[PDB]
Amino acid sequence: ITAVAPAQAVELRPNFGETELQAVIRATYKQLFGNTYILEADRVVQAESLLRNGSINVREFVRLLAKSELYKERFFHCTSNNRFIELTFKHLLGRAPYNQSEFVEHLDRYQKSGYDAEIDSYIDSDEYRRVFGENTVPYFRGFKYQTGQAAGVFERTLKLYGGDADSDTNRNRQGQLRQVDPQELLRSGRGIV
Amino acid sequence: MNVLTTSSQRGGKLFKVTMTLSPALSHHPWPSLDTYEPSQNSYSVVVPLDRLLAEMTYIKNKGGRVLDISPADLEALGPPDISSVAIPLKVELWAKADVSDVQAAIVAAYKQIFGNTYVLESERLTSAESLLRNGSISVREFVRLLAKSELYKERFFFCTSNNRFTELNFKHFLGRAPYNQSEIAAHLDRYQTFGYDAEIDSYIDSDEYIQAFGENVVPYYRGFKSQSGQTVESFNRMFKLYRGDAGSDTNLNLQGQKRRVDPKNLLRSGRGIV
Amino acid sequence: MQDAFTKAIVAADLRGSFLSEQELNQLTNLVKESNKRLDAVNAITGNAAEIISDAAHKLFAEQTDLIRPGGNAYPNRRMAACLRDMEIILRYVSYALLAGDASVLEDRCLNGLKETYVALGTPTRSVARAVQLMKETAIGYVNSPSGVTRGDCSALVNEAATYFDKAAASIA
Amino acid sequence: MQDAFTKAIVAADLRGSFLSEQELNQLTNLVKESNKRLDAVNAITGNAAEIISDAAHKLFAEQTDLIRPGGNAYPNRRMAACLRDMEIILRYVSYALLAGDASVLEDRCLNGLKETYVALGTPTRSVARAVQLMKETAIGYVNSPSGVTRGDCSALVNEAATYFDKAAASIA
Amino acid sequence: MKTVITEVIASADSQGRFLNNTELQAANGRFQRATASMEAARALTSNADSLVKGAVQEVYNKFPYLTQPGQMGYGDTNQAKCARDISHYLRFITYSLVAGGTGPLDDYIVAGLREVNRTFNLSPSWYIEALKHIKGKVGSQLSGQPLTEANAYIDYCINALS
Amino acid sequence: MKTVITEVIASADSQGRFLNNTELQAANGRFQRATASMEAARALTSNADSLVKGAVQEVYNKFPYLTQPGQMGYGDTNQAKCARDISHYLRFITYSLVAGGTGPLDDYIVAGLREVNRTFNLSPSWYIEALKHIKGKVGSQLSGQPLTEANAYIDYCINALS
Amino acid sequence: MKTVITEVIASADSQGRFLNNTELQAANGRFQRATASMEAARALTSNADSLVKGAVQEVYNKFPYLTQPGQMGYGDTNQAKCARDISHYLRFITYSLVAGGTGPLDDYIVAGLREVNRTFNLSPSWYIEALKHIKGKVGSQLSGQPLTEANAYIDYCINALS
Numbered sequence A: 001i002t003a004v005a006p007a008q009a010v011e012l013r014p015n016f017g018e019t020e021l022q023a024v025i026r027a028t029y030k031q032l033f034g035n036t037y038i039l040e041a042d043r044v045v046q047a048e049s050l051l052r053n054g055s056i057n058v059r060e061f062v063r064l065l066a067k068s069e070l071y072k073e074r075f076f077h078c079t080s081n082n083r084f085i086e087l088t089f090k091h092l093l094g095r096a097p098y099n100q101s102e103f104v105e106h107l108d109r110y111q112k113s114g115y116d117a118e119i120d121s122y123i124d125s126d127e128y129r130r131v132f133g134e135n136t137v138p139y140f141r142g143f144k145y146q147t148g149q150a151a152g153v154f155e156r157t158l159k160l161y162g163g164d165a166d167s168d169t170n171r172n173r174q175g176q177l178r179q180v181d182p183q184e185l186l187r188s189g190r191g192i193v
Numbered sequence B: 001m002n003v004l005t006t007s008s009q010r011g012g013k014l015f016k017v018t019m020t021l022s023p024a025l026s027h028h029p030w031p032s033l034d035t036y037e038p039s040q041n042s043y044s045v046v047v048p049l050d051r052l053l054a055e056m057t058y059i060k061n062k063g064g065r066v067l068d069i070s071p072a073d074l075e076a077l078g079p080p081d082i083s084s085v086a087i088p089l090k091v092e093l094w095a096k097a098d099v100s101d102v103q104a105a106i107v108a109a110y111k112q113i114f115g116n117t118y119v120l121e122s123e124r125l126t127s128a129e130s131l132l133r134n135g136s137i138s139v140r141e142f143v144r145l146l147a148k149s150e151l152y153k154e155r156f157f158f159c160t161s162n163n164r165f166t167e168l169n170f171k172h173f174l175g176r177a178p179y180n181q182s183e184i185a186a187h188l189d190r191y192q193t194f195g196y197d198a199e200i201d202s203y204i205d206s207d208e209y210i211q212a213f214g215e216n217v218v219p220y221y222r223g224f225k226s227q228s229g230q231t232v233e234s235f236n237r238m239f240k241l242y243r244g245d246a247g248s249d250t251n252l253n254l255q256g257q258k259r260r261v262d263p264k265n266l267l268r269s270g271r272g273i274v
Numbered sequence C, D: 001m002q003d004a005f006t007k008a009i010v011a012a013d014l015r016g017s018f019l020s021e022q023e024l025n026q027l028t029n030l031v032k033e034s035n036k037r038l039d040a041v042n043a044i045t046g047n048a049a050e051i052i053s054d055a056a057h058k059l060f061a062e063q064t065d066l067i068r069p070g071g072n073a074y075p076n077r078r079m080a081a082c083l084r085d086m087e088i089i090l091r092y093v094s095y096a097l098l099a100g101d102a103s104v105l106e107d108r109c110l111n112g113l114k115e116t117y118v119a120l121g122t123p124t125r126s127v128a129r130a131v132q133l134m135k136e137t138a139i140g141y142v143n144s145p146s147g148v149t150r151g152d153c154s155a156l157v158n159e160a161a162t163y164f165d166k167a168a169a170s171i172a
Numbered sequence E, F, G: 001m002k003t004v005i006t007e008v009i010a011s012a013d014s015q016g017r018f019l020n021n022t023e024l025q026a027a028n029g030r031f032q033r034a035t036a037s038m039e040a041a042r043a044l045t046s047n048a049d050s051l052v053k054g055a056v057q058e059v060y061n062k063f064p065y066l067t068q069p070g071q072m073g074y075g076d077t078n079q080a081k082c083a084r085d086i087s088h089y090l091r092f093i094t095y096s097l098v099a100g101g102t103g104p105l106d107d108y109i110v111a112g113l114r115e116v117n118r119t120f121n122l123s124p125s126w127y128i129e130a131l132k133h134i135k136g137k138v139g140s141q142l143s144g145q146p147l148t149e150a151n152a153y154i155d156y157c158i159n160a161l162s
């Protein structure tokens, strides 16, 4: 079942309660780290304090969490660069990648400008702005046909979403691999980008 | 996004920006029509220097209008310190002046009337100072003389709108902010039909002026303290009017002589007719 | 971000010049005292929790209004925010102390802070005091530690103080 | 991410033990040779561009099909991608060389790489060769540098080679 | 696992960048420091047995009531699991000494500490007092930069528990 | 501005964390290495100009058509702006030496380099050849770890331009 | 691949929208323009041989030194790879003419250009001078709107290289 995603984003409806803010914080951690347990000592207490003070929006809180060393240890240092890109599309945009060009552009940006500029490229994208805005937590989208999509994104986002008990968890013996095929990735486009 | 802490992360110069957004950047996820929150009509966000060009381009495209850019670190040091001016030092000119008693007065009238801009020595009104020294005129009399002078006309009137002139006039001549939208209007109509000179007289022959300054007292600040028949919001206008000891009236600003009191703000204190 | 060397470099560049023999030796001295500096930063890190805790106990000992209803360190949520801010400021003071320059403290922590607190209704004078208490205890630790070689750390204790004093001044 | 020490620690922990005197001295030796290691990593960093360029010139000298239409290093876009990959691999090999462990190379670069190239139609045997050429030139530089103290770097040259050889094997 | 080496490599990688003089200078620190670190490690390693028994006892001497019946310092299994736990801490301290960073402590003891201690009714105070005692005795096994290193990591654990 | 000190502080801050033994070990590297760095700095500082005139000329000797009329190594202003530019590079090299990292080079010469050179029709080849020459002569002004440092930064500029 | 047709379709698709009168008007431009474009294409196609040899030589005549030994305009292989490269440019110019947009140029020559040229030590100046020459001669092979089209695309390449 992916009963759960059709989605319903959560947010900071101007004048948020501490209970709604704690629900937003719990939702952002569940989305960015999957179903993986995070110890209370491992939480980015500085970024939570900035969001409590209303000094940052939900977009900037997601930026601070994705730039945190905890995200680098779990997803960047334990997986291959192509599997990292698949997971960053999953966590920040709620979708699979559309074509093999997006991977080459993201791999080339990462090689030229490093990790932090690659994270900013997803968050400053017009796709992030158009569909999450500033106050919505990231959520899974690949179950709705979206405008200007590629029908193969549904199947790929299903392959990336092993269900509400799955773990993009970096321990599975083999450890961090890949899940969308390069051959199947190539159907939908292939270009001498 | 509002009022900020800090400046930079890796290092930057944070600028805080302010705009007016369409439902194109921010909308609710509701069933109909796209709307942004009514209270974020003009919204502000602080962005470090690199992301800045990209942000402004985006905002302008999707419809917003930039209202301002100003460095964050300018804007972190609060509001002015007002201790020097909550309660000032009064300067008053006695009947038989002492030769330097009168020296005290002139330096102060200058500072206060001209709003702390430099008046260079070529610039000073010497013939008029001659008059005060001999007692032919009094301190209020002299104060009126500076206002009708070209130097006053030139740094404060000729290059700004009437809204601004009158707002400066209240600050200089009366020491207090302008209380109502009616005050602005009542004055603009006078200038229009009796000229500049009649209009200048109207602050110096007023009952309010006469009570506080009398005739031998140099006009001094008095709007940081509660006054009579003053709306309550005129005490926040005073912060907008006076920017600190080192601030001044200055017509030499890059952007020119402009306002300082929002027109919207004035209306909050009441709107009628005439 | 600046450190004490980077600061030198920026001033030199504004002249269009290679660093002056003046500036060179000022920096040679910073390298000379750097082991002491590392111990001083280590003194704070190694006792961060107690420095905050002890400052705290004493702040509320003095200002019992903050822990009454109506007070800015009541209920648990607000006390946790106040304890958190004590840590944040102690943290940026230690960064400045490793750097030999206040800029990280001023730019990432102190800039806008006063206006934040006023917007919040947080009594800045109480926050200034909490910073003064952290200073007392932090320096205590810088001066009396575990089996460090005996010598004179007063220059560094002063410099640490000015970072605590910057923060206090900026906030009150 | 692992380095050579971290690796020791993980194996010790799996026994439930403090590090063996065996493992201790193996690591004491790594510290012993660390200046040489820094020169070796520095040799690669200091000539990265030429190492990639020279590998490249030679790859296309041998395989003139890649630069014909129909070829995987044609047109400019593809050549830039190929030059970029040469840099990426040389980069993770240098990281492994600073670390004394291949893991960063295997985990962040080599894992999935072959299957990526096959999906793309990128000829893996040509990529393997480009890696072999980078190895030749990189080691060249590790062995013959600017005024480094004379000694024996063959142990480090071997280890660097195995990182180049891991990558080649993993990809072909 | 956080070491000086992994940290600089992480920072390079994330900017898509070869290691440069900034990063190699950093690494030299870690390598120059290894001698003091590893002396601390060897001393803590061979004294482990007694450091553990010393700290275990001190937990009971400072919290006398723990050793009465119905309490958590009573019976072979509690007292056994205690020695083990302090031994875990000393073990990771030696690892952190040898590794050139807090990584081993961060990954194997700090991540999750409070949740575990809270579910199992384990008071940090005991563990702080175990470590305070270990810190007292390590004053005479080491000196100079090996002692400073030992201290750095013991104190790091005490702050993790406060 | 990238130095060992700023890097470790940045890494602490971004995890909301006090500086720990990992970060202080790193800093000790930077401080231990200051002596060699600063010796290189003093030698490069006092023996300075001629390096610029030597490299400027070598650009014309290697690209003869350069010093001919209608070309960009001709007339007082081109040749003046050239000396200045190499002087800028040596200046930032000394700054990077003194600072303990590439920051000064990254912020004042590398960021924007290609865009500027491309708009103004300045070939990197000249600048590489200026630097290759400076590297040749610095072989006999320094030795040991001061030379390695000088080299590190000269080479860093050459890679920035390729 | 960017053409008027693909652009309007892309813009429709991205708004989830059928092509409307705005988009069909646009397409008519591209179709009305085909005659001039394709005349330029045929002229550039049959003169290709000589346009290429003319521009190749002009690179050596403007940069005489290139043809001396030890240089990059010397030996059969350099001079061969040069002719080829200019031929690639003219080829994509004809494609862009025929296609109704810059797509072929953007995808096959512009994307990646600088990185490649920088790794291989190829100066854009040569290529600009090849193209400036091709532009001179195409002045008398075409006129009117076919010349304007040829010019549009030649100039587009020159701006891509500056």
Ligand SMILES: CCC1=C(C)/C(=C/C2=NC(=C\c3[nH]c(/C=C4\NC(=O)[C@H](C)[C@H]4CC)c(C)c3CCC(=O)O)/C(CCC(=O)O)=C2C)NC1=O
Pocket (backbone or CB within 6 Å): A034, A035, A036, A037, A038, A164, A165, A166, A167, A168, A169, A170, A171
């Ligand atoms: C939808 C609700 C939901 C569930 C049920 C869930 C399970 C889940 N358990 C996980 C890990 C884990 N689960 C356990 C559980 C156990 N270890 C044992 O030895 C015991 C037999 C057992 C406890 C009874 C452990 C130890 C890990 C960490 C594995 C590792 O990282 O090595 C992970 C990987 C991500 C992470 O570590 O946070 C997921 C997704 N996640 C979810 O979101």
Ligand SMILES: CCC1=C(C)/C(=C/C2=NC(=C\c3[nH]c(/C=C4\NC(=O)[C@H](C)[C@H]4CC)c(C)c3CCC(=O)O)/C(CCC(=O)O)=C2C)NC1=O
Pocket (backbone or CB within 6 Å): A046, A048, A049, A050, A051, A052, A053, A054, A055, B005, B006, C059, C066, C072, C073, C078, C079, C081, C082, C083, C085, C086, C088, C089, C108, C109, C116, C120, C122, C123, C124, C125, C126, C127, C128, C130, C131
């Ligand atoms: C960059 C590092 C950093 C600092 C320094 C920081 C300060 C900071 N302190 C805050 C609140 C606070 N700070 C305090 C502190 C105090 N209350 C008192 O009465 C005492 C005088 C003082 C403790 C000594 C309190 C009570 C609040 C909550 C105010 C409120 O919500 O009403 C907030 C608003 C967000 C939040 O509540 O989490 C920020 C941003 N934030 C940061 O990210």
Ligand SMILES: CCC1=C(C)/C(=C/C2=NC(=C\c3[nH]c(/C=C4\NC(=O)[C@H](C)[C@H]4CC)c(C)c3CCC(=O)O)/C(CCC(=O)O)=C2C)NC1=O
Pocket (backbone or CB within 6 Å): A080, A081, A082, A100, A101, A102, A103, A104, A105, A106, A107, A108, A110, A191, A192, A193, D066, D071, D072, D073, D078, D079, D081, D082, D083, D085, D086, D088, D089, D108, D109, D113, D116, D120, D122, D123, D126, D127, D130
């Ligand atoms: C984790 C670090 C990392 C690596 C190693 C990486 C490899 C990688 N190489 C790619 C493409 C490529 N790689 C090459 C490489 C070559 N072509 C040849 O003919 C030669 C044999 C070889 C050069 C030696 C080419 C030509 C492409 C483009 C393929 C295409 O789009 O048609 C792509 C697709 C995305 C893109 O084009 O940017 C990835 C992900 N990406 C990464 O993030």
Ligand SMILES: CCC1=C(C)/C(=C/C2=NC(=C\c3[nH]c(/C=C4\NC(=O)[C@H](C)[C@H]4CC)c(C)c3CCC(=O)O)/C(CCC(=O)O)=C2C)NC1=O
Pocket (backbone or CB within 6 Å): B022, B023, B028, B033, B034, B035, B036, B037, B038, B039
């Ligand atoms: C928090 C809940 C909430 C409110 C209350 C809200 C008000 C609101 N009304 C708006 C526009 C508007 N509101 C009206 C309303 C009227 N026009 C008239 O002539 C009548 C007098 C009146 C209807 C009775 C109109 C016409 C606009 C569009 C103005 C324009 O774009 O020109 C906008 C600008 C964004 C948009 O157009 O979607 C906001 C934010 N937005 C919110 O999120």
Ligand SMILES: CCC1=C(C)/C(=C/C2=NC(=C\c3[nH]c(/C=C4\NC(=O)[C@H](C)[C@H]4CC)c(C)c3CCC(=O)O)/C(CCC(=O)O)=C2C)NC1=O
Pocket (backbone or CB within 6 Å): B127, B128, B129, B130, B131, B132, B133, B134, B135, B136
């Ligand atoms: C309307 C234009 C105008 C005139 C004409 C004028 C005259 C005038 N001359 C004055 C003083 C003076 N005038 C003089 C002039 C002189 N002393 C001598 O011994 C000479 C004989 C003579 C110069 C030739 C002196 C010395 C004083 C100062 C008297 C004092 O304060 O003791 C004063 C007293 C105020 C002052 O000192 O500034 C006036 C009003 N004021 C005016 O506004």
Ligand SMILES: CCC1=C(C)/C(=C/C2=NC(=C\c3[nH]c(/C=C4\NC(=O)[C@H](C)[C@H]4CC)c(C)c3CCC(=O)O)/C(CCC(=O)O)=C2C)NC1=O
Pocket (backbone or CB within 6 Å): B160, B161, B162, B163, B184, B185, B186, B187, B188, B189, B273, B274
């Ligand atoms: C610097 C020279 C200068 C200008 C240009 C100026 C404009 C100006 N026009 C004003 C009012 C006004 N202006 C108008 C004008 C109009 N009403 C309409 O419906 C028409 C569209 C338009 C006439 C064409 C009206 C009706 C008011 C009075 C608004 C009110 O009080 O409700 C006011 C407010 C003060 C007052 O009412 O006297 C200013 C300052 N003031 C100046 O000193």
Ligand SMILES: CCC1=C(C)/C(=C/C2=NC(=C\c3[nH]c(/C=C4\NC(=O)[C@H](C)[C@H]4CC)c(C)c3CCC(=O)O)/C(CCC(=O)O)=C2C)NC1=O
Pocket (backbone or CB within 6 Å): B224, B225, B226, B227, B230, B231, B232, B235
């Ligand atoms: C338009 C009519 C009008 C109002 C309403 C008004 C309010 C007003 N109250 C003020 C001060 C003040 N108001 C208070 C009032 C209080 N302190 C407390 O603790 C209590 C909660 C409260 C009394 C119930 C205090 C203590 C100050 C002085 C603040 C200071 O200077 O520190 C000031 C600053 C100027 C001054 O001190 O005179 C204004 C303008 N002013 C006006 O002209």
Ligand SMILES: CCC1=C(C)/C(=C/C2=NC(=C\c3[nH]c(/C=C4\NC(=O)[C@H](C)[C@H]4CC)c(C)c3CCC(=O)O)/C(CCC(=O)O)=C2C)NC1=O
Pocket (backbone or CB within 6 Å): B116, B117, B118, B119, B245, B246, B247, B248, B249, B250, B252, B253
């Ligand atoms: C509270 C005490 C106090 C201070 C400190 C003060 C500063 C001050 N300096 C000003 C102007 C100025 N200040 C300068 C100063 C400089 N120009 C340079 O190039 C140098 C870098 C620098 C001299 C070291 C200049 C040139 C202006 C005139 C700007 C203009 O009108 O274009 C002005 C505008 C008013 C005027 O021009 O008189 C103020 C208010 N005013 C005060 O009342």
Ligand SMILES: CCC1=C(C)/C(=C/C2=NC(=C\c3[nH]c(/C=C4\NC(=O)[C@H](C)[C@H]4CC)c(C)c3CCC(=O)O)/C(CCC(=O)O)=C2C)NC1=O
Pocket (backbone or CB within 6 Å): C032, C033, C035, C036, C037, C038, C039, C040, C042, C142, C143, C144, C145, C148, C149, C150, C151, C152, C153, C156, E033, E144, E145, E148, F021, F024, F025, F028, F029
């Ligand atoms: C892991 C990072 C790191 C640290 C922390 C470090 C500390 C360190 N502190 C040292 C000296 C010292 N440290 C101090 C510090 C003090 N003296 C006092 O009496 C005060 C209580 C305290 C003031 C801060 C003194 C006086 C010396 C001896 C003089 C000197 O070497 O400058 C030395 C030189 C060797 C020695 O004499 O013991 C080192 C290596 N080195 C490092 O690599």
Ligand SMILES: CCC1=C(C)/C(=C/C2=NC(=C\c3[nH]c(/C=C4\NC(=O)[C@H](C)[C@H]4CC)c(C)c3CCC(=O)O)/C(CCC(=O)O)=C2C)NC1=O
Pocket (backbone or CB within 6 Å): D032, D033, D035, D036, D037, D038, D039, D040, D042, D142, D143, D144, D145, D148, D149, D150, D151, D152, D153, D156, E021, E024, E025, E028, F033, F144, F145, F148
């Ligand atoms: C900025 C980071 C950094 C670097 C790069 C560094 C290098 C460095 N290399 C050294 C030695 C050396 N380096 C080499 C390296 C080589 N010998 C050869 O013949 C080969 C061509 C090359 C193989 C890699 C050798 C043989 C020694 C002397 C033996 C030793 O100290 O181990 C030394 C000891 C002092 C000396 O003898 O010169 C240092 C400090 N130190 C640092 O802090």
Ligand SMILES: CCC1=C(C)/C(=C/C2=NC(=C\c3[nH]c(/C=C4\NC(=O)[C@H](C)[C@H]4CC)c(C)c3CCC(=O)O)/C(CCC(=O)O)=C2C)NC1=O
Pocket (backbone or CB within 6 Å): E056, E059, E066, E072, E073, E074, E077, E078, E079, E081, E082, E083, E085, E086, E088, E089, E108, E109, E116, E120, E122, E126, E127, E130
């Ligand atoms: C790898 C690092 C690591 C640590 C640090 C660790 C701590 C730890 N201590 C535990 C239990 C325990 N810990 C103690 C501790 C003590 N009892 C006493 O006599 C003293 C008061 C005190 C020692 C100071 C006791 C009594 C238990 C049994 C709790 C229970 O199951 O009721 C458990 C529960 C699983 C078990 O029963 O073994 C964990 C996970 N586990 C780890 O894997």
Ligand SMILES: CCC1=C(C)/C(=C/C2=NC(=C\c3[nH]c(/C=C4\NC(=O)[C@H](C)[C@H]4CC)c(C)c3CCC(=O)O)/C(CCC(=O)O)=C2C)NC1=O
Pocket (backbone or CB within 6 Å): F056, F059, F066, F072, F073, F074, F077, F078, F079, F081, F082, F083, F085, F086, F088, F089, F108, F109, F116, F120, F122, F126, F127, F130
């Ligand atoms: C802070 C670091 C920094 C650097 C590195 C820098 C480079 C630089 N070189 C420039 C010009 C120049 N650079 C040169 C260089 C040379 N001419 C020759 O004789 C030789 C071939 C060569 C020296 C090797 C020439 C001739 C110009 C003038 C270009 C023009 O305006 O036409 C310009 C354009 C502005 C100007 O005309 O000064 C910049 C910005 N600017 C900076 O701010």
Ligand SMILES: CCC1=C(C)/C(=C/C2=NC(=C\c3[nH]c(/C=C4\NC(=O)[C@H](C)[C@H]4CC)c(C)c3CCC(=O)O)/C(CCC(=O)O)=C2C)NC1=O
Pocket (backbone or CB within 6 Å): D057, D060, D067, D073, D074, D075, D076, D079, G056, G059, G066, G072, G073, G074, G077, G078, G079, G081, G082, G083, G085, G086, G088, G089, G108, G109, G116, G120, G122, G126, G127, G130
């Ligand atoms: C599809 C579009 C496309 C373009 C435009 C292209 C350019 C291009 N030119 C190259 C080489 C070259 N380009 C030249 C160019 C010249 N030599 C001279 O005599 C003149 C100065 C100049 C001609 C004006 C030279 C000499 C080389 C050999 C560079 C080398 O490998 O050393 C290479 C390297 C691969 C190879 O050696 O063939 C590419 C990719 N490749 C493409 O796929």
